[PDB]
Amino acid sequence: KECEKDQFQCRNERCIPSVWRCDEDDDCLDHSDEDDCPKKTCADSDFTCDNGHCIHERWKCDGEEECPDGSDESEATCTNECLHNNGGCSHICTDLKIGFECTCPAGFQLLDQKTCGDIDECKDPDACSQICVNYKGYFKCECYPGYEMDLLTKNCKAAAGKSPSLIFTNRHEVRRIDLVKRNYSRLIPMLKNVVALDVEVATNRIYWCDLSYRKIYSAYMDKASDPKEQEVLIDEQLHSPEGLAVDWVHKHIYWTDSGNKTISVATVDGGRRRTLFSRNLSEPRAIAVDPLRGFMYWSDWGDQAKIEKSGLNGVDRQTLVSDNIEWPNGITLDLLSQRLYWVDSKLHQLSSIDFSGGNRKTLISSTDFLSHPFGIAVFEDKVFWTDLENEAIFSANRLNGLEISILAENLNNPHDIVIFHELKQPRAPDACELSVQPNGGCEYLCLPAPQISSHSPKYTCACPDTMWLGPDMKRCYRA
Amino acid sequence: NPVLLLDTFDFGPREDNWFFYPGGNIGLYCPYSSKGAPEEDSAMVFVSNEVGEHSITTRDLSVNENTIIQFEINVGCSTDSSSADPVRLEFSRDFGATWHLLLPLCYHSSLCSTEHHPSSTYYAGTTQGWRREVVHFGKLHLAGSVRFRWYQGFYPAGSQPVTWAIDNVYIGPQCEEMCYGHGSCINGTKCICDPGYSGPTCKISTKNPDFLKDDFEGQLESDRFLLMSGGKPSRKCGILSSGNNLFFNEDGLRMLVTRDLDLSHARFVQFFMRLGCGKGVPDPRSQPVLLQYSLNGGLSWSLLQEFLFSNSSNVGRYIALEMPLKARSGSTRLRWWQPSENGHFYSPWVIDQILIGGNISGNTVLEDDFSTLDSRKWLLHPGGTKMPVCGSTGDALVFIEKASTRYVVTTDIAVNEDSFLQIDFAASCSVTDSCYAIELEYSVDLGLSWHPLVRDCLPTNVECSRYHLQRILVSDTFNKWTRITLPLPSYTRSQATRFRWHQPAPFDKQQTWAIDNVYIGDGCLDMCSGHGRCVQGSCVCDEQWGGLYCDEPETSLPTQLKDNFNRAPSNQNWLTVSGGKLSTVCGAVASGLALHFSGGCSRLLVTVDLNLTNAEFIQFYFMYGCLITPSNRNQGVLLEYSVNGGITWNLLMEIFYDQYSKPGFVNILLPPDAKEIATRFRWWQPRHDGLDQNDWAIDNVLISRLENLY
Ligand SMILES: *[C@@H]1O[C@H](CO)[C@@H](O)[C@H](O)[C@H]1NC(C)=O
Ligand SMILES: *[C@@H]1O[C@H](CO)[C@@H](O)[C@H](O)[C@H]1NC(C)=O
Numbered sequence A: 001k002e003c004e005k006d007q008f009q010c011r012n013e014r015c016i017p018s019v020w021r022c023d024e025d026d027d028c029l030d031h032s033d034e035d036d037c038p039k040k041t042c043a044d045s046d047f048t049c050d051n052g053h054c055i056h057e058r059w060k061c062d063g064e065e066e067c068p069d070g071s072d073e074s075e076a077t078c079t080n081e082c083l084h085n086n087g088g089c090s091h092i093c094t095d096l097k098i099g100f101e102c103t104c105p106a107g108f109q110l111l112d113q114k115t116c117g118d119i120d121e122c123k124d125p126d127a128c129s130q131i132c133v134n135y136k137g138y139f140k141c142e143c144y145p146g147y148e149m150d151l152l153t154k155n156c157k158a159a160a161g162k163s164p165s166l167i168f169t170n171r172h173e174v175r176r177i178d179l180v181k182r183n184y185s186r187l188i189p190m191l192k193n194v195v196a197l198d199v200e201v202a203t204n205r206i207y208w209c210d211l212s213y214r215k216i217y218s219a220y221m222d223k224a225s226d227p228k229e230q231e232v233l234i235d236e237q238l239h240s241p242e243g244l245a246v247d248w249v250h251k252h253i254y255w256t257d258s259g260n261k262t263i264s265v266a267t268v269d270g271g272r273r274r275t276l277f278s279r280n281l282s283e284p285r286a287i288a289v290d291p292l293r294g295f296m297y298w299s300d301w302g303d304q305a306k307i308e309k310s311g312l313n314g315v316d317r318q319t320l321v322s323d324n325i326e327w328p329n330g331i332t333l334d335l336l337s338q339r340l341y342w343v344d345s346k347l348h349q350l351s352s353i354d355f356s357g358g359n360r361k362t363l364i365s366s367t368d369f370l371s372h373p374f375g376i377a378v379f380e381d382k383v384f385w386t387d388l389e390n391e392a393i394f395s396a397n398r399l400n401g402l403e404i405s406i407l408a409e410n411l412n413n414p415h416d417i418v419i420f421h422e423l424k425q426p427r428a429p430d431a432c433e434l435s436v437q438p439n440g441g442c443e444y445l446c447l448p449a450p451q452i453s454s455h456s457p458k459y460t461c462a463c464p465d466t467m468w469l470g471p472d473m474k475r476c477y478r479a
Numbered sequence B: 001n002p003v004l005l006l007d008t009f010d011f012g013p014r015e016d017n018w019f020f021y022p023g024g025n026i027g028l029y030c031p032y033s034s035k036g037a038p039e040e041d042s043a044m045v046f047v048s049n050e051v052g053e054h055s056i057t058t059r060d061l062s063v064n065e066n067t068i069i070q071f072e073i074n075v076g077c078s079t080d081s082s083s084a085d086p087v088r089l090e091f092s093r094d095f096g097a098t099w100h101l102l103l104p105l106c107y108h109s110s111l112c113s114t115e116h117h118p119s120s121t122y123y124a125g126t127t128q129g130w131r132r133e134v135v136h137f138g139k140l141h142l143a144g145s146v147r148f149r150w151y152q153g154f155y156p157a158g159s160q161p162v163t164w165a166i167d168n169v170y171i172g173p174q175c176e177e178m179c180y181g182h183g184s185c186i187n188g189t190k191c192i193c194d195p196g197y198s199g200p201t202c203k204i205s206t207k208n209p210d211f212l213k214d215d216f217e218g219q220l221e222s223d224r225f226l227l228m229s230g231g232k233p234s235r236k237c238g239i240l241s242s243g244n245n246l247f248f249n250e251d252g253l254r255m256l257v258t259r260d261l262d263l264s265h266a267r268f269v270q271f272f273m274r275l276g277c278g279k280g281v282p283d284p285r286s287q288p289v290l291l292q293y294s295l296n297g298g299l300s301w302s303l304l305q306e307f308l309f310s311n312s313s314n315v316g317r318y319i320a321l322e323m324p325l326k327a328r329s330g331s332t333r334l335r336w337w338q339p340s341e342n343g344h345f346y347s348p349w350v351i352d353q354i355l356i357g358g359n360i361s362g363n364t365v366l367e368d369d370f371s372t373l374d375s376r377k378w379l380l381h382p383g384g385t386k387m388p389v390c391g392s393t394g395d396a397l398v399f400i401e402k403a404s405t406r407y408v409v410t411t412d413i414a415v416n417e418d419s420f421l422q423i424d425f426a427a428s429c430s431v432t433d434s435c436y437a438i439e440l441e442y443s444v445d446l447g448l449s450w451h452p453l454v455r456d457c458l459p460t461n462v463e464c465s466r467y468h469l470q471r472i473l474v475s476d477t478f479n480k481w482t483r484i485t486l487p488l489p490s491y492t493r494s495q496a497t498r499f500r501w502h503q504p505a506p507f508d509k510q511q512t513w514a515i516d517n518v519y520i521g522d523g524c525l526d527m528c529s530g531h532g533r534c535v536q537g538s539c540v541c542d543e544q545w546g547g548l549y550c551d552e553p554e555t556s557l558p559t560q561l562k563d564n565f566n567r568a569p570s571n572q573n574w575l576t577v578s579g580g581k582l583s584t585v586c587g588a589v590a591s592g593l594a595l596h597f598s599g600g601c602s603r604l605l606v607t608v609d610l611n612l613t614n615a616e617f618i619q620f621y622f623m624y625g626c627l628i629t630p631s632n633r634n635q636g637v638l639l640e641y642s643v644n645g646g647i648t649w650n651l652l653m654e655i656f657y658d659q660y661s662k663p664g665f666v667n668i669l670l671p672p673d674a675k676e677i678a679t680r681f682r683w684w685q686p687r688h689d690g691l692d693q694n695d696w697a698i699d700n701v702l703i704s705r706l707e708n709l710y
């Protein structure tokens, strides 16, 4: 016997409201609902009383009881050498009774031993949304090309013109949500079983994948609803592709397939194709490309959960995340500030990491708003995601993790989500076209290489799955 | 001689503007912005290292009533407010011999006017960053020639005052309409507008909020309050049981200014305020708290209410004030200020739960189903959460969490002759078979006084036509979601009645409740005949009920009822059976088992709706006191009937407490008035002395006509 959705199950088979989990009342009668409850340490410099209640440091040691047990007022609580020459202290000094103390002001708080130096503010990813310049004792934010600093708010917004949309799959249809207006429209009606999609903004194409017909399709958005104007790109050799990614610079589609257990690549027309990875993949899900630096990133929730990283030609594969990771199944990139965002369906988290793999940050950790999340998207100051238990798309401030709004709801199967906007897909040179020979010399595929040094190779050729690259590095040899 | 003055300090100091400046060397002060928008401009910067005098005098300049002094000051650059070393803006009319403060400290307790405002002294700790200060000359009695000083004091070596600085000084004519308060007037010809505001005069901007609320939460950045001078978030001497409040203990400036709000249709400002935090009475030389309002972004202020300290102002009190016509603007800001001549204060004071809003245009409807918790409908709701519960349709507002206070207050609405109240209510959903009730109340004085909505009306009182208890919302009968529909009694009629659901202390956490699908209005008709819900002025009929006003029945209703109480009560027969169960304890009322009402809580027996158009009689057996006899007339069971699906009942018999000592046979002709197509019956006991006491029992119920006989 299990409990209903919003109940907690006691060890003695009894169901209580889950909001009575960890509130210091034994409601199960066998103390079950009050076991392994997380303890409490407060904000920046707040005093923890003997029972875990949070009071400001200044109320402590003043004769008045603040904490509900009154333990800041027992003797295990407490303890002008200061104005004259400043008494060894550099900036702000206040005289304490048992010894003097020395702290700093706003903008420079870092001290070795009570002498203060500047805060380097740009050693934090989410200090500014975009560009961060560090000065002595303060800092300043600027905007990446295409973005204007809104003077009323804090934020770098997109230059005025065409406004952001969200495009997402409801499993049997695709829906578009305007963002400036609220203009909520059905972009494709009547699909069998579709969880994966991506868009090419500049040519106005939508790419999506059906798991039941086992095909990958493509259409123009103005004509996507007309079944005749939906083109089949791939109709063979697919099992269950759950992730898609379009490389807009170099005209390739990348997909995962958790059935065949592979990661693949194909030309946008679907005419030339290679499998890039077969081995050490269990349940690969989401895939995203960084075509400006030649990389691709993906997730898998097999027994060993990873976010992995490789070149767009599928060399130089490395694991990027393998700790505190259970069920990661949504992934998105901020290309300009070189930052990766993921959601974890089991651990109920929304986290971020550097493209390099460090400066890892747990942005949101709410079991209420991240019950079973799936798709994830990023634009300007906000992060978006879809939830399967809450039947909805949420938004939030992606710098702090706060301001969690609820963008649309009453959605039965909301899976994958993309931001449709010109600025998500910057223009970049395609090296397979600025080349001595057409198509970089290649007979089949020209795949962008990962830029590791400033002079790496810019591309490399690739052959069908049933053929090998010859010694010229450019021709395909038969079997 | 000169007509104006101007100095940005960005391009060095400017010889001809000033006489001299002891202690201020051009540079960078308080540059920081956590939002990454720093002040990089240069300023006059009177450090706490410079020895001797800290000041700055202007050259004598000619002046009239159009002259304004406009400048950005920064004293201290932090939020530890202090009255030490304030910066005074003084003027000399005697070629720099003796100086007077440009503004006096006007208030009711001097070259003063009617209005109340603080002097031109600028204390430390009022903001983090740079503030903009503007003084007008029109009502000062100044014309001709004068020189101005920003003064801090003469200081010895080794004596560290507070640092201060100043930027962007201007002493010329005012602009067109004073830039509306949201712009830095330059040369009297050019408005340099504030962000969000556009146009030559700064007139064009986005519409303001028409509502405001701050219970005081840990995200205290939000642009509700333009400044919170000398006031900290606290839990010390909370007026709420254990809420979070705003405390004014520090000395310096004590002000609280809201953002500009759309008050063009506002009814009220309300809040809790304790003027004096401690044990004994705060001393009668403590300065009163003034509540003021500006129509023009803070150039001139009117008084709403003075708040004096007294012997009886020691504990929290709910303030509610109707909004005066002269305060209803597209842009109006309010301020709370405690005056002080030196800047020191005797008594500390505290504030919580500030709400500004309301719609004075005579709105007569309030509807909700709880997609959103629109807090301009639900002003207050402590201990309540938006969530589903007990298989609610979508969400309900739910009082389930551990909290020491549980209530919910509606905003004001116009109640009239056709107004009615309709809600879905539910209690514990079988989780605890405890006995409790929720108080439903109302107010016509903006919640300064709450009155129970319905009162005990019993047949003892002859001036009662309908009979009903005050405790409508009991936990046994409303165990699972049920609908209540009350016509609104005449004592609730007004332009602005508000309503409350209150769970009085004490209670257990386990005694939970929820409300969903609230309609309080005058819409629809007939209150949907009792078989419906008013949704946006149209009846949404119940299962098996049709018609425009929910009175056309879709299926056939039973024409006969019969129970001998051999099996547990069926819902084929009985809508509700509360407090009663089958037993033989009562001997033999009619035959074998009977239904016996011996419960600790409610004793209620209601039938399904019946088609009684051709029925003749209602009959049953009745017996009192199988354990204890009823002692009052008010312990007598009542037999009523409703024909509007339970909204209003009609008495058909008082079963007097003193008869039916022995089991008796009741047998009544149905009044023409009860033989309608949808009629139900109830048996209920208004009052009893608890479990197992003053009990009664029914057997062989039969509502019917005479048989066809073959
Ligand atoms: C992938 O799956 C399909 C069956 O769905 C199969 O026909 C195809 O050969 C498989 N390819 C690989 C590489 O496993
Ligand atoms: C105030 O009430 C009237 C109805 O009387 C309505 O038309 C108007 O939109 C309301 N405005 C607000 C802000 O509630």
Ligand SMILES: *[C@@H]1O[C@H](CO)[C@@H](O)[C@H](O)[C@H]1NC(C)=O
Pocket: B553, B555, B556, B557, B559, B611, B613, B614, B677
């Ligand atoms: C009530 O009963 C009468 C017959 O006595 C019948 O004509 C009528 O249709 C019935 N109406 C309902 C609502 O049951």
Ligand SMILES: [Ca+2]
Pocket: A020, A021, A022, A023, A024, A025, A026, A027, A033, A034
């Ligand atoms: Ca508990």
Ligand SMILES: [Ca+2]
Pocket: A059, A060, A061, A062, A063, A064, A065, A066, A072, A073
């Ligand atoms: Ca204390």
Ligand SMILES: [Ca+2]
Pocket: A080, A081, A095, A096, A097, A098, A099, A100
């Ligand atoms: Ca000391």
Ligand SMILES: [Ca+2]
Pocket: A107, A118, A119, A120, A121, A134, A135, A136, A137, A138, A139
């Ligand atoms: Ca810095």
Ligand SMILES: [Ca+2]
Pocket: B008, B009, B010, B041, B042, B043, B167, B168
């Ligand atoms: Ca300047």
Ligand SMILES: [Ca+2]
Pocket: B215, B216, B240, B243, B244, B245, B352, B353
């Ligand atoms: Ca509060």
Ligand SMILES: [Ca+2]
Pocket: B369, B370, B371, B392, B393, B394, B395, B396, B516, B517
């Ligand atoms: Ca609801």
Ligand SMILES: [Ca+2]
Pocket: B564, B565, B566, B590, B591, B592, B593, B594, B699, B700
């Ligand atoms: Ca019987």
